[PDB]
Design a protein around this nucleic acid. Structure first.
Lengths: 93, 163, 102, 83, 91, 93, 101, 163, 81, 87
DNA sequence: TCTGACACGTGCCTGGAGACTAGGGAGTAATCCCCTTGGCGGTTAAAACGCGGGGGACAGCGCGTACGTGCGTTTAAGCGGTGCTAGAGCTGTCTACGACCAATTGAGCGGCCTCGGCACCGGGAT
DNA sequence: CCGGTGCCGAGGCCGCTCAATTGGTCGTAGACAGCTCTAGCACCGCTTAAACGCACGTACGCGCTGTCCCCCGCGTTTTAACCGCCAAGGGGATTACTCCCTAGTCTCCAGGCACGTGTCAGA
């Protein structure tokens, strides 16, 4: 009871490209801890990066700079290209 | 462009292969081998800004125009809403010399495009801001290596073509 | 509709915002930061899921076993540079040999 | 209260042999099985002690999977699939 | 022929993903190591397998680098000096 | 201007055991960054340690557990023995 | 009479408490936590300063140079394990040689 | 002791060398080589609780007393206000057998001290809870290795003296 | 403009660093490999420092920014902040 | 002559790598990430004291990699393994 | 024998300390099960031991080639001293954006069937 | 791998507490704006340590061989690892309430920061 995992969202984002591929519960917990560790890494990097500028808030630029810090190479470029597209489709409404 | 207030005159055109397609948000997947390309055309006239194009822009302190040869463009960086690494040109203070110096162009300077080749402008030789090493090579030989190969080797390619 | 439906994403914006507020990362939290974070980790989950699906389709299997996730992470260069200090449950080892042995 | 008198010998020599065949080793010397078990003891003496201090911070008496995965997360040996 | 079923065992254990280290001796080892830190301390059964997976992925990463140090030294067998170097090259 | 360091406290704790030994300003900045790195290490350990039990109050128990997690060997054994001996004199007054 | 004098230490308890409040490490902070961190910071600084003074006395110098601090750190065992991923500027390297050279 | 409510009957005696001194807060410095020792005597009668002493305490479930031979004591741990690793003894269910099993004793159980040697109690042989391997060695031979050497080697010393 | 500046650090400087490391003899083919190691190392550290500076809307990489970038990479430098 | 140079460069704490080549090197590397980007005068010295520490920590371990293989002169394959084993 | 940076009184001002309030989070007691541990049979899959051998490990050697070292020789590195100027770090407004307080509600976390792709066999070529 | 049961485990289906969402409202930290001054860049020059070569012996890298011995591998014994199953028990949850302890806000003041001139290292 009251375990906020990432099971159904990962299962939904799997089936939107490869709908004929199942996923085990152990691999589901692996991906849950995977996105939880990436969330903890980006959140701690944004916390330290907002502390380094004497700021009190975390905007989208803070998380964008922290995720360009953490992820290496072209994957970070594709990640920020996805994130900026999503926030421009979100906020412009 | 600098920010989203200046990014209201361009859109993201994400060509997957050498053909011109979009296929959603950058193929919806990150795919190696098939290196994606992005040239952003304005909706007023459709002027392409691609990897290897020569754009014209007035300088921030001079006022006299200058040509920038685009080496790379990175979508949605941190300080800018899109970054653009372009090779500079040498002003005669109409023949324009080539320069392998990278710089960044903003959207409030770019006016028109001009494919500067040898005989609206005329290239003579690749040169340097030091003032020597004139190598009479046009831009048609390096644009294929720019468009086909990532610029991590094309930087050393046009650096070795000089000197 | 929720903020995830307004963003065009399938990952929870409000859960990430609640975890950011309860994780003691800052006193204040901007508006674009949780939707940017959900977009980033949604893209990361989608990429690791499609690479695991490619590893499963290269084994003629459908259910993604953790061995498929290991062989999908270690075969990619930038994911292995990202997950350099990781240990995956039931992953084994890469199929790898050196030329100075055979 | 079990008399586990040097159970580091419980990791027997074909177990280190199987681990080396997984790692890609053709043949092993005979003066290695005494050393690899000492390396394992020195590694577990760090990570188990970190997990014990983690689980006795919370006034508990069970070492759960969250405790060992947090102790491995702090040591730069981040395990997945448990929390 | 000598030295060809070792490559067969390598090909068997590289395609597989099972647990090479046994469960109960490793459990007794973890218990006798934590015996010096807390008496009557019980372990969750998931945590013992978690420690076993971390030990296995640490030991095969040590053994791959040890075999690489032996290969660079123009040998195919490993010695104690290789693992001494690999511990002094990884803290 | 108005940038707080630990210079005077390090100088005072040096001048009560080795009173005839000076200290350079470069070594002063080295020791200041050293104790600042240890402070942020113990703070970021106690933050994640209080997050693991769903608490919101860092106490002496949390910092003592984090500093026996960070400092290795008998150095932590002398450190917590000094810390408890100091906080008993503090809270006993 | 003050808080640091009531603790009996030479390190600021109030600055530690203010930095703990402003550093986003928790929502609430107990009483014993900043004085415990003050005590352990004072102990660590006192030990590293005693070892640096030992290096300065064994090198016939009256001021702590960074070479004295790096020799004091790398000559100790547990301080080197605490500061393994630490590179000190203007300090060079620990003097050691291999027997097979 | 468990907490500070039960730690009001003992004080920290920090002997630097083999002689009995205090010299402030653990020599005011951490010194290698000269390994510091701590035996905590109660102010009622001055009964020493040292590294190698045999204390008597009633069990938490049995009620019948038991002897604990102190192997190590660690000042100001996390759960307890001071931790004490002591070797257990075998009850005859008056001769007492030795046991190399570590355990932890709390302050609400300890009553008196008794130097159990061979012929208030009498030791016969080191044994085990399995019920065999009787090695007729008294406690006088191991207390010197306990007091002189850190217990990381004394554990393997009395483990190798058995079996 | 700036090109082949990795040959500015020369093989006697690598000889000095190797004598500080404690070698007796080195090869003549290790210099390009040491330059290739240093290139990737300074590339990662300079890229992290540039990210830290470009976050703060600055146009000058500070010593505090580069010591934060070295702290994040597990190579915590002292004496600068 | 050799071990005298080890004893000299192992006791003194001078700047081994030169200042202005290191300046031009970090400027050439940073020019691919931000053009017309300035550097603090303490930041380049911090980069030098970190780079010459990492290189010495690499060299003092590839010397162990050389003497592990019963040889004195190091090789490119020594430092390749010395970086590849931990980085 | 020389001098050139490091350390004791110096006004202050602004951050630390005391006091007086509530509110809210931990800390005592309290169920009750949801996980362990443990000791029983069992049976068998690796583990242990012994020998054969043969192929790699170590050691000596001899041809030799790349490398430390010695001595010109450029030559670019280090210090200084300019000028200048780009931007870091301030103060000041205010403003736009987030925290916090009720209301609501779909949603996304738990039960519950309902099938369905992987296992490992005969045995067949891998 | 054909393919057959089967199985046990994920996939839809239902479904109901509850935290995500909306709406005002206040309040408060960042965004512009100036400034200013400060630390960093360029450049010329002046010495000047030192990188850059050529020889040159020479000493270790490296290939060959030769011995030898130690571990790979097989065959027999053996023994405890895995399974499982029942049973006991004990500690990890989750109320609960309360209480005391700490955030907030004044409140007073003092302490520890920036100079600074007297004083103490190096060559």
């Amino acid at each position: 009871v009251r375990k906020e995992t990432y099971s159904s969202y990962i299962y939904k984002v799997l089936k939107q490209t490869h709908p004929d591929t199942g996923i085990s519960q152990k691999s589901m917990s692996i991906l849950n801890s995977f996105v939880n560790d990436i969330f903890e890494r980006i959140a701690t990097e944004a916390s330290k990066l907002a502390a380094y500028n004497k700021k009190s808030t975390i905007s989208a630029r803070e998380i964008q700079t922290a995720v360009r810090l953490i992820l290496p190479g072209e994957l970070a470029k594709h990640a920020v290209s996805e994130g900026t597209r999503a926030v421009t489709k979100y906020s412009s409404s | 462009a600098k920010t989203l207030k200046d990014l209201q005159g361009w859109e993201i055109i994400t060509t997957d292969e050498q053909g011109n397609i979009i296929d959603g948000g950058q193929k919806r997947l990150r795919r190696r081998g098939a290196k994606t390309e992005h040239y952003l055309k304005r909706s007023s006239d459709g002027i392409k800004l691609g990897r290897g194009d020569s754009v014209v822009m007035h300088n921030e302190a001079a006022g006299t125009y200058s040509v920038y040869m685009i080496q790379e463009l990175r979508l949605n960086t941190l300080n800018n809403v899109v970054e653009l690494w372009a090779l500079t040109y040498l002003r005669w203070f109409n023949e324009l010399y080539l320069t392998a110096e990278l710089a960044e162009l903003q959207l409030f300077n770019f006016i028109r495009v001009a494919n500067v080749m040898d005989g609206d402008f005329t290239v003579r030789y690749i040169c340097e801001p030091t003032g020597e090493k004139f190598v009479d090579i046009n831009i048609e030989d390096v644009k294929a290596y720019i468009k086909k190969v990532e610029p991590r080797e094309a930087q050393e390619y046009l650096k070795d073509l000089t000197l | 509709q929720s903020r995830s439906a307004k963003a065009g994403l399938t990952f929870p914006v409000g859960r990430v915002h609640r975890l950011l507020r309860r994780g003691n990362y800052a006193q204040r939290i901007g508006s674009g930061a949780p939707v940017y974070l959900t977009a980033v980790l949604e893209y990361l989950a989608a990429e690791i899921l499609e690479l695991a699906g490619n590893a499963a389709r290269d084994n003629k299997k459908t259910r993604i076993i953790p061995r498929h996730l290991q062989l999908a992470i270690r075969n990619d260069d930038e994911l292995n540079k990202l997950l350099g200090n990781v240990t995956i449950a039931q992953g084994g080892v890469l199929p790898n040999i050196h030329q100075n042995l055979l | 209260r079990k008399i586990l008198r040097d159970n580091i010998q419980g990791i027997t020599k074909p177990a280190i042999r199987r681990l080396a065949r997984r790692g890609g080793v053709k043949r092993i010397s005979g003066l290695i099985y005494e050393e690899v078990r000492a390396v394992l003891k020195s590694f577990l003496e760090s990570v188990i002690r970190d997990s014990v201090t983690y689980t006795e911070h919370a006034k508990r008496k069970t070492v759960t999977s969250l405790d060992v995965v947090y102790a491995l997360k702090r040591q730069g040996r981040t395990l997945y699939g448990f929390g | 022929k000598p030295g060809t079923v070792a490559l067969r065992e390598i090909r068997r254990f590289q395609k597989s993903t099972e647990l090479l280290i046994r469960k109960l001796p490793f459990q007794r080892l973890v218990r006798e190591i934590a015996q010096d830190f807390k008496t009557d301390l019980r372990f969750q059964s998931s945590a013992i397998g978690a420690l076993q997976e971390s030990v296995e992925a640490y030991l095969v990463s040590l053994f791959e680098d040890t075999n690489l140090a032996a290969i660079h030294a123009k040998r195919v067998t490993i010695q104690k000096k290789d693992i001494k170097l690999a511990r002094r090259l990884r803290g």
